[model samples]
Structure formats: C-alpha cells, structure tokens
Target: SNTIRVFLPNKQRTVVNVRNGMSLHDCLMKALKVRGLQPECCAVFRLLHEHKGKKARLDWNTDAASLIGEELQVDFL
Candidate 1:
C-alpha cells in the first residue's frame, strides 16, 4: 500500500512497491538482495526512514504497513 525508495551504499537506489502482505523486514531484504547486497538478516541490514520530520530506523520485525511511503536510507554500521 506504499511505495518506498531504497537508497543503497553503492550509491545506487531502488524503488519498492509494497504488495500484498509485505513485512518491513521483507521489504528490506528485497531492497538489498535486488542490488546484491547479500547482508545478514539479524545483524547487517540497517535502514532508516525520515518521516513527518523524524528519522527512524525500521528493524527486522517492524511492519511495512506503518509507512505512508517514504525514502528508506541505508546506513553502514
């Protein structure tokens, strides 16, 4: 129900169109894997979203339904 702009660390970015029952964690995995990031689900994938003037990190279990469409930034950590 939302469109997400996922910016990667390689200076490449991809857009994700949320489809039926896509979790926030699933969204993150698709973003990274599509770009061949191949990161660890529990430890390596770091994503941030700045929405309504606040920057928040959406982790492994956060629901994608909470977003109203935003740019997801990748952070190296």
Candidate 2:
C-alpha cells in the first residue's frame, strides 16, 4: 500500500522554502494573479546577492526540464 498527502506554502520566504516535493511554478503563478499580474506577463527574478551566480531561467508556460543552464538559482518571493 501507499500513502499520499498534500502540503501548501506557508507564505514564508525569509526563513526557508520547505516544499513537499511539489513544483514551485504553480504557487508562483497563483501569487502573480493575486497581485493583478497576468501569468504570461509575470517575470521571475533571482535574489541571492551573497551567493552570486547564474540566474535561473523559468519556463512558466513550458516544461521545467526545457530550461537551459548548467546551474541556476532563480528566486521570486
């Protein structure tokens, strides 16, 4: 037998990003809508000044594996 459960975002970021192995794209899309921003027009940004690195590319309308880049740290919260 198997078990399944669901976890929702706590709307907290300054602390940590504890995800229940769920793709973050969904949450991001919803947040944008709440702010009156169309999902298509929404542009995700990365904020890691301490850990400067390559920016992560987001395929909000496409597949995640479709992203290009050896290492990415794209963050938007």
Candidate 3:
C-alpha cells in the first residue's frame, strides 16, 4: 500500500491511505473519502489533476503511476 499527500486550501494537506497497483483514480477511492473530503461518491466527483508536463491530456483519473517517496503528492485542484 501507499499514501497520498492532498494539498487543500490554507496550505492544509492530508496524507491519505491507498492500495498499491491501482489506477490513480481508484487509489483516490480511499484518498478521496477517507478524510475531510468524505464526499458522497467517487463517480460523482472525478478528475484529480492535470499533467505536469509529459501529457497534458492524460489525467490522474485513469493514470497508473507512483510517488515521491513510494508516496504521492497531489494538489487537489
């Protein structure tokens, strides 16, 4: 398993738990609902973030990738 760093407003951030080898979107199933977000559902709230450089069109929603320390750092934009 791994964790994600969610950067929220006011410089607020949270490290959320995530299972390994899953799509970035799937990972957020827990990363999204496990804390302050606690949204109604994942399907309703989609799109994690934009690509840094490589592929602007390829989103985190389906991108299978990794982390900064075997842990991910994400800006909830």
Candidate 4:
C-alpha cells in the first residue's frame, strides 16, 4: 500500500491511500464523493510533476496506478 497527496483547486488537498494496481480515476472519484462533491463531466484533471512546471492531463482513458505512493498535484478545470 502507498499513500499520496492530491492537490486540488482553491488550495484544497486530500491524502489518499492506494494499493498497487488501483485505478487513479476511481481514487479521484471516491475522494470527491467523500466530500459531497461530484466531478463535472467536462472537467479536466492535471497531474503535475514534482520537478515543477511539467504535467499531464488525465483523460478518460488515462490510468495512473503506476504512480502509487507518489504525491500527485492535480488541478480540476
């Protein structure tokens, strides 16, 4: 198991615990649902690299289970 921190808009952040092979999208959905929020269908989630200014947009087909245990900076827009 691994723990990661997800950064959101408005300076909001959530700590997520993940196991290997876990779906990144699922984890994100659960996180928002826990806070009584539903992610918008057209929203875009960006994953930022720790080195700064480098990031990737997470689309419907993207899976980030390989990044488990790493802190993820995500922006929903």
Candidate 5:
C-alpha cells in the first residue's frame, strides 16, 4: 500500500494511492483528471520534487517506476 502526496499548481493537495505496476505518469493523470483537469492523451506536464523549485525532468514518459513514498508537485505548463 504505497502512497504519494501530490501538490497541484493551484495549491491543492491530494494523496494518491499507488498501486503495484502503476507508472508515475499514470498516477499523475488519474489524480488530476479526478479534479476535473483533463489532460490530453499525449499531453506533457512538468514534475517537481518536494517543491524544490526546479523541474525534476525535461519530460517524463510512461516508462517511469512507481512513485511510492514520493512527494510530487505538478503544473500544467
């Protein structure tokens, strides 16, 4: 039962339960879509770690590992 704390760009927080075999990108999309943010199927978003004020990566694909026990912040820029 792994979990992740996500901080959205609107200063909203959500706790996402991470299931086994789920990719980080998938988890993020599900979390946002639940809040009425429908990202395009091939959309791109920026991920930051613990509000570090730096982009975690240039772009993340669907091949990332499970983001269990991680604090992720995302923006739709």
Candidate 6:
C-alpha cells in the first residue's frame, strides 16, 4: 500500500442546530472555523445521525445531508 491518510476532528458533536436547506459542507466549514480550521486543509467527511440512526460518508464535494432536524457527525481520515 502506498497511500497517505489525514485525520480531522469531528465537529458533529458540537453542532448547535441544523436549519432546513442548509448545506452540510457550509455547516462543517463554519464549525471548523470556530476551531480556527479550514476545510481546504483536508478532505471532507460526514456522519448523518437522526433519532437513533447514523450514516457515515466521505466526499470532497457533496451536500452530505438535507432537510432539518437531522443530526450529523464528521471526521477526516
């Protein structure tokens, strides 16, 4: 194997709320900004959690999640 992986802390736990029609990418970016971080530094990761369900995913350009009241988590690897 000849690959390098970078890890980013998850910001989902810090989420205050998810407004309808809000972009997941923007949400994560803003959350990172609170910690003095930038999304460009690494790739994007997501974990959409609602009720007692969770879905993990990764992508450089994707909305990740939609609708309101959908809890989520994110991390880089």
Best by lDDT: 4
* Candidate 6 similarity to native, TM-score: 0.44
Report the C-alpha lDDT of model 5 over 1-77, residue by residue, as the tens digit.
37767666567778778666666667677668777765553234335645666655334555334555666655665
C-alpha lDDT values of all predictions? 0.60, 0.37, 0.45, 0.63, 0.60, 0.47
TM-score of 4: 0.62
Q: What's the lDDT for residue 43 in model 6?
A: 51
Where is model 1 more than 4 Å wrong at Cα? Answer: 41-54
Taking the tens digit of each residue's C-alpha lDDT, what string does model 1 give over 1-77? Answer: 36767666757777777765777667667567766566552232324433344455656566555554656666565
Candidate 2, residues 1-77, lDDT tens digits: the string is 01111112234222123234444365445444454545454444443346675444555443333222222232334
State which candidate, 2 or 6, has the greater TM-score: 6
- Work out candidate 3's RMSD over C-alphas: 6.5
TM-score of each: 0.62, 0.37, 0.39, 0.62, 0.60, 0.44
Q: What's the candidate order when arranged by decreasing TM-score?
A: 4, 1, 5, 6, 3, 2
Cα lDDT, model 1, residue 6: 61
User: Backbone collision count in every prediction?
Assistant: 0, 0, 0, 0, 0, 0
User: What are the per-model C-alpha RMSD values against the true structure?
Assistant: 4.1, 9.2, 6.5, 2.9, 3.8, 10.2
lDDT of 3 at 52: 40
Q: Where is the poorest 10-residue window by lDDT in model 5?
A: 38-47
Q: Residue 31 CA error for candidate 5 (Å)?
A: 2.3
Q: What root-mean-square deviation over C-alphas does model 1 reach? A: 4.1
> Better model by TM-score, 1 or 6?
1
